[PDB]
From Swiss-Prot:
GO biological process assignments: actin filament organization; antimicrobial humoral immune response mediated by antimicrobial peptide; branching involved in mammary gland duct morphogenesis; cell adhesion; chemokine-mediated signaling pathway; chemotaxis; chronic inflammatory response; cytoskeleton organization
Provenance organism: Homo sapiens
Coverage span on the entire protein: 24 to 97 of 97
Protein name: Eotaxin
Residues with glycosylation annotation: T71
GO molecular function list: CCR chemokine receptor binding; CCR3 chemokine receptor binding; chemokine activity; protein dimerization activity; receptor ligand activity
Compartments where located: Secreted
Domain of life the protein comes from: Eukaryota
Amino acid sequence: GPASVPTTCCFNLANRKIPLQRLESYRRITSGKCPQKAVIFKTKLAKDICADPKKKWVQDSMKYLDQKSPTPKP
């Protein structure tokens, strides 16, 4: 059986770049459990992937999703 949930840290960072049209959302990591912070991307196929915050497609991806937010309020 799995330890509660089958997810802890994104050690297997994705090398390939994920598209925006196929992107659905993203989950950034910065808790006090993992050894290194990272990001997670979700496509339009009910699937999640790991991504590093020092990547070009990840940076644009994070900024893309982060930019998708509204102008006012936090």
